């Protein structure tokens, strides 16, 4: 097999990591296990520490707020790798044992057990003017040589890898999403009925999404247009409970329905990133470096879990909107509209490999 390795610029400290995508099962997260090779002749008395930080840069990196830091560190774990097993004995995964066999006796393990409820690696699209660190939560494993934990770590003898925390589509699809509404205007005492439903609940990136629209217009009003929009909600919890809807795919069909009539149809639309390039703030799936990645996958957060800690929670909704006429015997050019929303999941299937930005 292959193990990734990074080296400190000074070259006296190297970090070996088994993989850079750590799948997040809802109950528990895969441990971040790895090895660090040090130079005892160089670290005569200083210790070698390792940390796993979960940075979050919702604030504009290119800008700054006076007297305040828009950044945040949801999770920060520490471990005293060198000297070895200072606190207590810990089991070594087979990968760690293999690395220790391959590397000399100067290689020492490190392992992190991430708490279950934490954000997934997501980044927001920066647009054609911004630069620097990409906005959005992301994880990092940083190993350094310090005499004390709080002492400043010289950047010339510390090495940082960027890891990813990803979730894969649930194995058992849930109930098919469906929705229905019945509006009643002030013109006729009859209900305009709308009913929409998707083919399935879990969709894989690039797979087309099918909406089975069914309208019954018993009222004396005519519907002009029908708009189907797959839109993305990004619940951010940096300072507030914000919401950022952003239509990632749209289709506007001029299929009218006469009064006291019916209309059943199937609209197929596929959300992809080719035409969503300019939409700043769109949440992408997360990248190790500057590269290309699909639209951010949904988040399978546990039901009833506190939302305070969560950094970014992504979800998707297909919105069906009927642009019903508002014309009458005497009035303006108004045209009301009824709407319905269908939640679905947009994730990857559980793979045997997932190269981030090959």
């Amino acid at each position, epitope marked *: 097999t292959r193990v990734f390795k990074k080296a400190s610029p000074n070259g006296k400290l190297t970090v070996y990591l088994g993989k850079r995508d750590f799948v997040d099962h809802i109950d528990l997260v895969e441990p971040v296990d790895g090895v660090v090779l040090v130079d005892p002749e160089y670290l005569k008395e200083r210790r070698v520490y390792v940390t796993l930080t979960c940075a979050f840069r919702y604030g504009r990196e290119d800008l700054d707020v006076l007297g305040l830091t828009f950044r945040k560190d949801l999770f920060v774990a520490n471990v005293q790798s060198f000297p070895p097993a200072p606190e207590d004995k810990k089991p070594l995964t087979r990968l760690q044992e293999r690395l220790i066999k391959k590397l000399g006796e100067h290689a020492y393990p490190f392992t992190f057990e991430i708490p279950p409820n934490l954000p997934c690696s997501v980044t927001l699209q920066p647009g054609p003017e911004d630069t620097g660190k990409a906005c959005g939560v992301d994880y990092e494993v940083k190993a350094f040589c310090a005499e004390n934990l709080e002492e400043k770590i010289h950047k010339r003898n510390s090495v940082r890898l960027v890891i990813e925390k990803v979730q894969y589509a649930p194995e058992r699809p849930g109930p098919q999403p469906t929705a229905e509404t019945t509006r009643q205007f002030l013109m006729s005492d009859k209900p305009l009925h709308l009913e929409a439903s998707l083919d399935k609940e879990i969709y894989y*990136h690039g797979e087309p999404i099918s909406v089975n629209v069914h309208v019954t217009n018993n009222t004396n009003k005519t519907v002009k247009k029908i708009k189907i929009s797959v839109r993305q909600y990004a619940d951010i919890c940096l300072f507030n409970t914000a919401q950022y809807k952003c239509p990632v795919a749209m289709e506007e069909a001029d299929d009218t329905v006469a009064p006291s009539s019916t209309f059943c149809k199937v609209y197929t639309l596929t959300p992809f990133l080719a035409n969503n390039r300019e939409k700043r703030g769109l949440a992408l799936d997360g990248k190790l470096k500057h590269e290309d990645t699909n639209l951010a996958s949904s988040t399978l957060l546990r039901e009833g879990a506190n939302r305070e800690i969560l950094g970014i929670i992504v979800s998707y909704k297909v919105k069906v909107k009927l642009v019903v006429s508002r014309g009458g015997l005497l009035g303006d050019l108004a045209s009301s509209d009824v709407a319905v929303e269908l939640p679905f999941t947009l994730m990857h299937p559980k793979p045997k490999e997932e190269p981030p930005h090959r």
Partner: antibody, heavy 119, light 109 residues
Framework: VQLVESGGGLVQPGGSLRLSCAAS????????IHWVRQAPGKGLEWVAS????????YYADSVKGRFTISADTSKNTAYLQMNSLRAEDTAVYYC?????????????WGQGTLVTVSS | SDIQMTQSPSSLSASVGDRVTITCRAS??????VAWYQQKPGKAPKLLIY???SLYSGVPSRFSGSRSGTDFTLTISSLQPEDFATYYC?????????FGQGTKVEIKR
């Protein structure tokens, strides 16, 4: 799951031609479409590629400008528009598909259409 | 970058049941992103192994792929009379994708 290529035939040198690869069971957004040409008695050579999910389009350095690759997602079809054909473009052109997300080799191939550019 | 892959040998004579090995050397380093195709005369290629170690779903277990440094090897442990074709080698890490010269497996007589 059957990509089928068509539109290949004899063309005078410097002429035009259009190869159409119709994919059945593939979503042009979850798959990337490549055109690979094999000369008579020679190894395979990659000639073009299109990935619609990102809109990316790549060509081999030997067919820059002359060849244009497009995709009609409505018909789930890919087109190679070959203009100004030199005598070195005679070959069997096969259309292949690859998993769009995390490319894992050219899964499925077309049956290949001959293209004979001779005066 | 334009990476040139050299597949050797360019010919082979082997009898049924023998072990056949074909090697592929890449100019630069390709991180396990190599695939092995198999084109019989007339027909179109067919993926056999991807990532230099995996087997495509539907391939006989005799075919095996291995990597060492920048040298990849495809091994048919027990050659069968249906395994005598031309086997190629692709390196799909850097655009443009490059194929090997093609190794042709004959039948010993």
């Amino acid at each position: 799951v059957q990509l089928v290529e068509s539109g290949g035939g004899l063309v005078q040198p410097g002429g035009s031609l259009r190869l159409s690869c119709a994919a059945s069971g593939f979503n042009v957004y979850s798959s990337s479409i490549h055109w690979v040409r094999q000369a008579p008695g020679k190894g395979l050579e990659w000639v073009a590629s299109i990935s619609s999910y990102y809109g990316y389009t790549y060509y081999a350095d030997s067919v820059k400008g002359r060849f244009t690759i497009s995709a009609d997602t409505s018909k789930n079809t890919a087109y190679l528009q070959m203009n100004s054909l030199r005598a070195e473009d005679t070959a069997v052109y096969y259309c292949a598909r690859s998993r769009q997300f995390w490319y894992s080799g050219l899964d499925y191939w077309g049956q290949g259409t001959l293209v004979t550019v001779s005066s | 970058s334009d990476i040139q892959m050299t597949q050797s040998p360019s010919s082979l004579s082997a009898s049924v049941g023998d072990r056949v090995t074909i090697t592929c050397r890449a100019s630069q380093s390709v991180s396990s992103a190599v695939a092995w195709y198999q084109q019989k005369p007339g027909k179109a290629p067919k993926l056999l192994i991807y990532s230099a170690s995996s087997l495509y779903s539907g391939v006989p277990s005799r075919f095996s792929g291995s990597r060492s440094g920048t040298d990849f090897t495809l091994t048919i442990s027990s050659l069968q009379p249906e395994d005598f074709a031309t086997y190629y080698c692709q390196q799909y890490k850097y655009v443009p994708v490059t194929f090997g010269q093609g190794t042709k497996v004959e039948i010993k007589r």
